[PDB]
Design a protein around this ligand. Sequence first.
Ligand SMILES: Nc1ncnc2c1ncn2[C@@H]1O[C@H](COP(=O)(O)OP(=O)(O)O)[C@@H](O)[C@H]1O
Ligand SMILES: Nc1ncnc2c1ncn2[C@@H]1O[C@H](COP(=O)(O)OP(=O)(O)O)[C@@H](O)[C@H]1O
Ligand SMILES: [Mg+2]
Ligand SMILES: [Mg+2]
Lengths: 48, 550, 520
Amino acid sequence: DIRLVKKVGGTIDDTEMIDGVVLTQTAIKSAGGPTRKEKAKIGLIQFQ
Amino acid sequence: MSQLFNNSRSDTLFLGGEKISGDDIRNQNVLATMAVANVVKSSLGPVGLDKMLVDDIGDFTVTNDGATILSLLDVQHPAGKILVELAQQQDREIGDGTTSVVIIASELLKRANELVKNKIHPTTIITGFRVALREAIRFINEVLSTSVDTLGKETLINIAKTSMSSKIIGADSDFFSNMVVDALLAVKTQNSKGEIKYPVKAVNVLKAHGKSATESLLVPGYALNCTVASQAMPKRIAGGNVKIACLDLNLQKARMAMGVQINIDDPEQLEQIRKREAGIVLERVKKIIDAGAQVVLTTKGIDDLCLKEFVEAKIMGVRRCKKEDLRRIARATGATLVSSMSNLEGEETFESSYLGLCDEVVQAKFSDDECILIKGTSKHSSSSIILRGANDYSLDEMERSLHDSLSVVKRTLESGNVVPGGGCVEAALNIYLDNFATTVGSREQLAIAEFAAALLIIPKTLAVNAAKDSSELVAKLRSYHAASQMAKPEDVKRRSYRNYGLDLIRGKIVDEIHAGVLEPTISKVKSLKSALEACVAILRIDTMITVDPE
Amino acid sequence: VFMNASQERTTGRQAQISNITAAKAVADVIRTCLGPKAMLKMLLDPMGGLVLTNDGHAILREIDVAHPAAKSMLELSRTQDEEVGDGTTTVIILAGEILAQCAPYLIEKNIHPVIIIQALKKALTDALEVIKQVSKPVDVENDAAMKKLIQASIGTKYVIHWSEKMCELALDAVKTVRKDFEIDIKRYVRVEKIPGGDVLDSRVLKGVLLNKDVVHPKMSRHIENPRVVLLDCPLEYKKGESQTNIEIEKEEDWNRILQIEEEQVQLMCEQILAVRPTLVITEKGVSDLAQHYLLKGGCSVLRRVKKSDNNRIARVTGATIVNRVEDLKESDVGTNCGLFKVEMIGDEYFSFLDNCKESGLQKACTIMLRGGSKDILNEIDRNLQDAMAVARNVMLSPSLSPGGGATEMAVSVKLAEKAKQLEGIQQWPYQAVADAMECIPRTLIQNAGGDPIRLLSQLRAKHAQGNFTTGIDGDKGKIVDMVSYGIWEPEVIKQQSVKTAIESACLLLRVDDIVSGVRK
Ligand SMILES: Nc1ncnc2c1ncn2[C@@H]1O[C@H](COP(=O)(O)OP(=O)(O)O)[C@@H](O)[C@H]1O
Ligand SMILES: Nc1ncnc2c1ncn2[C@@H]1O[C@H](COP(=O)(O)OP(=O)(O)O)[C@@H](O)[C@H]1O
Ligand SMILES: [Mg+2]
Ligand SMILES: [Mg+2]
């Protein structure tokens, strides 16, 4: 259940615990989509 | 420093290369550390000199940045890759202190290895470095100086000249100072609900060799490097409110989706189907021309089929360019980048809100290269710098010289507190840690005392490359700093010293405030933290094990 | 071992000595290539050709020099060519002498390079002001003044015998391309060469010279007023982006497929006949079926044309390139074509398009050249590019600098006077710049066969009292003034020689160590 995400760079002191799910994958941004959404409902798409 | 190699024991067998243990590993770690350290020692400081590296194809690279030098060096030693990746981590995050963090971390390994032979345990040595670093950071916060009573941009101008030193632009740093400060202020944006941030690399760097470097023009706007599609198009747009169209859609003869196979039972349908293939593209370009767009930017190549209508309509066509370059054009001019042309309704349409606005769009020819100069943007301002030099190899150095100057000024406006440079902090941290550890003492006093003298490698290396007397300058840096540490904050005098020293040009001790040399506080922090992790990781290694490749 | 490194690492002063010695050998080869008496250098390429020229640009380009510092001198050749095109040999000789003359020290004085660089920046600023004071402006509208200006670069070449004819070709080529500020470019100037013939018979002809004969015997090779229309699309049958894959159920459908291919091409030919063009130029290949319906209406067919030639044809006749035949209109049809003729030469056919010469887009023109062989043509072409580039500097920069080595010697005199007044620690690097400036006029004496000791001694004495136009005579090796010498050179050529040479010297002085063969 515990998920440990690794990111290159930084210092060990910067390690901290997050109160929610951390997404390792990154957005697309090729079409210029908003990277920050406040009070949003996160969905899951198993189709294509 | 390793002789006789090592006797292979038959009772100890492992697949692959032999296993070496004991003091031989730490002796080879320092030997591999001093190998990459001696390369960046001569390149440090305004009196320093860079090195040249041949690529075996006849091309070379001339740069003063320690990150590029170490990046071109592929180290087969396992512990040697840490210092190589340390420079790539230094310029990526802070953007400054690349040569210093390699030299600081090198002296930390040389002194600690001599302490391991003293029989003190490495963890006690590491404990001494971490306790001394915690108090050293607190001393950095005490020497912070907030800019006050300064006239205009002189605060950022004097700080930008520090990064320009030691590089080919150091002699021209007087003229280049106003170009770097005005470049990052034009790209100023807003994010995080009120937080001010700056883009990296947003300022375009164009390479045209000719005239002189002091004549480099600063364009009040973004400049894009591309060649015009058709030579019959006008290279200069007259009149204000020039409309720029940023598009990701190429105009070309295109094949229908691979999942489609055309089967026709009549020969009469061959005329309309072949004509419609080119007619579908006409519907997209026709609505754009009718909107009055003067300049049309396109991410992908455009065939000559659609370039005919651009000549009759006096529209300037554009072909393949970098995707990240077209984003800042639409944001500056007000245009909206369109990945695929569509509307909420099921019918195709084009809105005038997707067109940018600027004062003019002109194409200037620098030497034999032609580039577009976009000046007077509407929505957001932009900037570009065209570097000029004698040869293309000097322009390659001026790019990294300009990129490093943009990172120092970027960290300057994020934190108003700055610290004096030129070996002043390294000399101040020495005495502060000398009186430190005297209260605790015991065994940890020796490991902390060596950490204070380890920071002395930076001010001593600067005096060696100047062909001057180092012992004369180092003895002065210890004279002014030591006596003033005990001062009481009244009766003045006192602490007015210790804030300056180590001027390499005149070889005298002068005030850094009147000189203008300054460094951001962000460059000092995280440099010793990254150098500590590089020192701790190598020091903790007793035995190196190498496995032969399959 | 460790990484990729070591072998023999050159460190200390010997690393800078190797940079000075290697860069000095670059200027020693073309040292005899300076002056009107300059010799020639024959180069042997790995491709099997031959390059014989006195221009330091083409000499240093083909020669393969393997060395970290010496290759930086090779890059300076394209700096003078691409920005200006004249003075490539002077920059290499000057930059080669500056590194030797301005930095013999650190072998002796042990002066830090940056200290010398700080003096080189101040010496470059003062050198520009001296050139501006000795430069007298010249009228750009005087034809007699432009002819003697083009002969400046011609005096050192082989075309000096034809210089009277050469200035006629270079003046008309730059004035035609000039568009009204007055920005011109050599991309529209055609370098096409004709093997054999007499140099006096060569002339600049307006229009584009095509190497292709008419396609059909009934095509008229003589037209009084040709009308040219450019087509990017091929006259053949377009297959399309996707396969047609006709499924033929009945035997009558297959014959209709081949029948439409004749009518579909005919449909594109009927739309061309609406503007009744006399000459049709197609960028791609043409079918033998399309030429018949064009011949019936009077249109002329030609071989496929490269994209580079299509842009020059549109400028001469004012035509607009039309890809879509359906969108072809009378407004895009080229007019005002003087003559269309084809002359027979054993190698290839040649098609001539003459302009009626009578603001708009800049006109295009081709330069015909009749040499004695194929390699002589390539030498004059490099001479025309150097001669026509001189006319581009005077139009953008009306200022006119002194020639014949008077520019470099005038700076050396002013630097020596301010060297004693400056004093300080920078007096040695600042005074050493004047010693490198007098080497260029010294080369003129060594090639002429005179005594550089007695001539340069009287040149410096007569420079202060007499005038700033005093210089070395190339042919007679005597002391003459550029006023009566009648030859001058633009200031842009002298400014690029001082800036490029000094800015490049600062790069080689900063080199500490050299490591070869690190990785790729
Ligand atoms: N003009 C100058 N005068 C005195 N000290 C300087 C000057 N320029 C830089 N320094 C000092 O040299 C150190 C290293 O600078 P530099 O070599 O430009 O960056 P890096 O070490 O990242 O390559 C800095 O800490 C700064 O204090
Ligand atoms: N007839 C001449 N007499 C004396 N000096 C000349 C003569 N012609 C050219 N020079 C000098 O030689 C220099 C280079 O001229 P030129 O040989 O035409 O160009 P390049 O050296 O690039 O071939 C000029 O600066 C000029 O002062
Ligand atoms: Mg720096
Ligand atoms: Mg010449």
